[PDB]
Design a binder for this molecule. Structure first.
Ligand SMILES: [K+]
Ligand SMILES: [K+]
Ligand SMILES: [K+]
Lengths: 480, 480, 479
């Protein structure tokens, strides 16, 4: 069976609308990729070591894929998924065989589009992945990964990535990032500040996180005023690594505006070990405001990623640990939650906040009204389960009416799967084009406006929001 | 004015999409109906007595219809709706006359589609229902009901129903199901286990339910371990009557994982008469887990139907009683709610749970993320008010990207109106055809995949999910 | 760059569906405007004084426009927005300049459609608004407002408005309405009862509104039984001014059924000064039921507009005050909330309630199942942030299947911007035509049904629902 990957995919069937869409996408398809939020390993580009298997690249590290298979009765051992006891005994060929046999599950899901984009456009496959085709797929991409063109830096250059952001905590060292810039390569690989491990006292890996947060900053992190200094010192070390943004994956969008003493008192109680869910929530809430207060000084762009019920499968958390596809969205609140921070700093020009959600109902109700008013608020793209074609379309249909396009930030891939990056960004460009085309076709915007918009949405608006206009000296110049 | 019931109804207007839709539907339109959850009376097929009126068959027992009329100033006595004081004194012809004169209300509703299917396909009417057409409709339906071709069993065969499930509690007899099997007629009419009345202590008809639950089981029902034995024995009796499923219509999706002594303690308090809203919730929650623990042994597929505010009209509950169209959906939660059961049994191979909702906002947020991960969880079709062209489409648009298609169970009609069964299944088939057609037209799926999926969704997937693959000897063999 | 305002705007691109839409809209485009809920100033038509600037008419009063600009970093002083310290020192021409340079922000928003309608249809502009175009736009509409064709009364007649309802509290005078109905101009301008200031005790302007509520009624407003009489007497004065409606903008849709004695107990505590959030909520809850009980006698139609977290920007409330575009929607509940009122009066033929929402998730879940059952309940059109093409389409797509079309109430504009009224009503007619066309094209309704429906939805249904069938003798006959 052939792999048919149509040049006009994701555009609406209506030929009038499809013709407008294709023209808008034409203006935008070969523009460089700006990836200002993501979870790729910077040690891939630091060492420039090859990837080994198809499984180690596409199957084992991607939770979107092994979720579905786990959901249908397949063990994580059968797919070589990294356990807490280490990498399983399974043959990487046999792990791939199981995936290929279960590839039908992904029909109508965005993984069908992303992987077939990788298969047809990166590897040049001409047949569709099945059980009969499985081994041919395995050894042909294993062989491709051994070649010099499929080295991490070479792929970065081939994919036309202008900016790539990894996410690191304050307790981990930025040694791999230093290696990117002191090598002459010039690929603009940046970091972002995720202090979640030293902010969430209910995190099980928080005691060890605090311990190496002390090493990296050289401060008394168990006393409040030097805990804050430690954040300031580490933030500056991130800005020195090029970072322009901070990221905050809290369970809630809650913020608080405690006095310096009220915060210290709370900090003392939690460090003492008297950790209640109420105190831990309030500290996370106070830290959002505290991080924003530092952003007034150091100029970091603040991303809030709330609403994930992390580690919902308890039995899986014991056996395999974090990020194994069992993080489930919760209903999130913003109007009452963000009010304390917005009372203090909501009209401040020096602050920039980008809001994400796992709860689509808040789009037209809360997010678009808030962001269409507050100078500091901006709207991030549809995230996680919603970075799909239908989720992206719902975003545009529900957000634009009140917020407009200029109160959004564009798109990020938000992935560990490196090869899927051009695939994911392509999908975004086509869906934006489809939305914009429909506005032209229904005479809700002029074509001249639409042609200005995709270039803005794709390229200019991400760059302004993430303060990416100032390229460093160690990076390549920005060219079209 | 003519009854124009078009061949291309429910397909999108876009001609390229419409023609894919038409092609997929043709592959599926004449497949047998599998109806694994519903509320038809089993006595209809055991006695094979004819229906009497157009009013008694279409108007009086259907709450979808009299709701709208009651909503517009019509009394239920005017429409011959069974009161708590019995069947009203009004003329069935006059009841039909009022409905006919108010049939315009249903413009744009799915009942327009279902009833016009019944009028044009089942009865062969050629004119549209109006006030001046009313009497002609009444006596032509009534005359038709006297014929041998409109006997319940004869209609079951004409409709090409393969499997029909009814819904009984543990306190009622499986009298009519035994009579169906024992007869020469080979219709596969089965049952479903719905223990709601002996589980909800806040149910007003619970003390009488518990009383006859003791008669049907022969057990000490007001003592814990033998209340559980009474459930096991009754479930076995349902299995022997052909049941493959259980059904749970609780106010919430809440589950619990109490110890044996904690469960007995709570049970004893409620049996004593200390029914507090908190304790009644906890028992309904604990019983969800308890039914799943029984399902580990007997293989009953567990359907959860939560989130209905039953009997919202208090005045109507006093005068007429239950199921009179005053049950309003509530905001429903699944993530925290289902966690205690999923921690215990979420990764078990032997357990099969099907989740339904009245809260469409949980599709992309909670249900699909949960069902796209857990081995035990599957998604039921859009239910009740969302069992409709716009509703089924929203389900498919919001659920597919995370759960896929193979984590869904197809379609159930969930109706008492027997004549609307082929009408409702036809709507399911056209909307599914329309959705798949849009995937093909926008090149998000290959035609080959869509042709496979339409047949699976219609026939194979409802069969697998409801364990309908073993026909019993007392029914017909399954042919296309 | 030309101002191209296409004659088939807002209809779907699909040529067959579009052709149906165009035919349904043709049946309805020139019908008179029924505006059963709005916030226009009755003194405009009473005095018939002209409007001054482009800024004072279009930019400064409309919060949809200055929301977007403030959101991008523009000060409200730079846009001549009324502060608490009065009208700013800035030039109206220079305020217009800022808006014109930032008109690109409104791409994809309903403000694009409304304003270009005003620009092309009301004014006759031929070029698109830009920074280089700013000054020409300003003084050409400044000069047009001086002319006799653009006087409030002349525009009312030109726009073919049949009915206009304004919104007044019980503590203010209906002098301007009295001036309307005694002059020879036959424009049907009515009012609507909005008792929010004398019911919400957490309102900062409540103690002052209680004082003038006593003045206009001549009752002991600070004791329960005469407080209720003060409402009844003021409600009669509104009906004298032609009002058919009351409006209730509470934070919650909560209702209550307290006894006469529990209600007085609660009232007495709040008048004492013991205002707690729980007591204030319960009073707002009880007062909804009380207004409903009054509606059984005087026949007023009850509009519930819940869910707005008003004055979310604290610093802006202190500096500029109310209605400055910082009123954010909250999640709203209707099922448990409306139950105490519906247990008492849910089946009563004399009662009419119209339900609004700011929370689109309640449409298919709560609002349509409630309205598709209870004899008293009806659904108002998509409100505020949702009175827009995608919002109205989501409304129709989520409400119709359970509630039907006859449990809805048509459209209202809900606006201060008087020139935007025909624009907003046109959008409503185009989207309704679009939705009905899609039903016909998918053969879910017949064309005969759709042809009846847009005329009902546009004209007949709003009139029946707001009891606008009996024209008073001071107003022009409807034609
Ligand atoms: K599953
Ligand atoms: K109604
Ligand atoms: K903003």
């Amino acid at each position: 069976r052939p792999l048919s990957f149509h040049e006009d995919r994701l555009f609406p069937s209506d030929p009038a609308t499809r013709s407008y869409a294709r023209g808008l996408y034409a203006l935008v398809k070969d523009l460089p990729i700006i990836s200002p939020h993501g979870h790729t390993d910077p040690s891939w580009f630091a060492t420039n070591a090859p990837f080994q298997d198809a499984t180690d690249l596409l199957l084992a590290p991607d939770h979107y894929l092994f979720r579905m298979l786990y959901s249908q009765g397949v063990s994580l051992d059968a797919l070589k998924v990294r356990s807490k006891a280490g990498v399983p005994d399974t043959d990487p060929r046999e792990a791939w065989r199981v995936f290929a046999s279960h590839f039908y599950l992904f029909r109508g899901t965005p993984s069908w589009v992303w992987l077939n984009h990788v298969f047809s456009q990166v590897f040049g496959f001409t047949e569709f992945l099945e059980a009969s085709n499985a081994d041919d797929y395995f050894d042909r991409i294993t062989a491709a990964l051994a070649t010099d063109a499929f080295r991490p830096r070479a792929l970065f250059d081939r994919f036309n990535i202008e900016t790539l952001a990894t996410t690191e905590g304050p307790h981990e060292s930025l040694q791999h990032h230093a290696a990117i810039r002191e090598s002459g390569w010039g690929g603009h690989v940046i970091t972002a500040y995720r202090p979640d491990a030293v902010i969430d006292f209910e995190d099980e890996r928080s005691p060890r996180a605090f311990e190496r947060f002390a090493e990296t900053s050289g401060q008394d992190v168990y006393s409040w005023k030097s805990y804050l200094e430690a954040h300031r010192l580490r933030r500056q070390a991130f800005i020195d690594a090029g970072a322009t943004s901070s990221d905050h994956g809290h369970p809630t969008a809650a913020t608080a505006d405690l006095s310096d003493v009220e915060a210290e008192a709370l900090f003392n109680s939690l460090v003492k070990g008297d950790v209640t869910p109420e105190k831990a929530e309030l500290f996370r809430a106070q830290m959002l405001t505290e991080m924003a207060k530092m952003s007034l000084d150091d100029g970091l762009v603040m991303q809030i990623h709330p609403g994930s019920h992390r580690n919902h499968n308890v039995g899986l958390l014991n056996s395999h640990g974090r990020d194994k596809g069992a993080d489930i969205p919760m209903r999130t609140e913003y109007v009452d939650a963000l009010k304390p921070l917005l009372t203090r700093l909501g009209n401040d020009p020096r602050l920039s906040i980008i809001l994400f959600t796992l709860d689509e109902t808040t789009y037209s109700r809360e997010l678009a009204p808030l962001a269409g008013h507050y100078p500091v608020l901006k709207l991030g793209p549809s995230w996680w389960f919603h970075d799909s074609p239908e989720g992206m379309m719902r975003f545009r249909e529900q957000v634009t009416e009140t917020a407009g396009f200029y109160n959004t930030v564009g798109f990020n891939d938000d992935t560990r799967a490196f090869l899927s990056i051009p695939a994911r960004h392509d999908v975004a460009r086509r869906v934006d084009s489809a939305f914009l085309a429909r506005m032209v076709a229904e005479h809700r915007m002029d074509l001249v406006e639409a042609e200005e918009l995709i270039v803005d949405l794709t390229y200019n608006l991400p760059k302004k929001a993430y303060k990416l206009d100032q390229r460093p000296d160690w990076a390549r110049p920005a060219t079209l």
